[PDB]
Amino acid sequence: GSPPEADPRLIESLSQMLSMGFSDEGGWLTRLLQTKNYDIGAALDTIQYSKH
Known part of the structure; x- marks a missing residue:
């Protein structure tokens, strides 16, 4: 569902x-999100891979 610290700081x-509605499949964003110290897989998974 909605996890604290595993949704906001990630979906941010x-x-x-997300300002367009697309996730990074080319690893381009991954590097960025990595700024969080973990993985965008969990992040990009919010731009779609779930429910609108």
């Missing part, structure tokens, strides 16, 4: 990308 870094 996307605020920069």
Whole structure:
């Protein structure tokens, strides 16, 4: 569902990308999101891979 620290701070870094409605499949964003110290897989997974 909605996890604290595993959704906001994650879905935020996307605020920069999600502004279109697409996830980074070319590893381009991954590097960025990595700024969080973990993985965008979990982040990019919010731009779609789930429910609109």
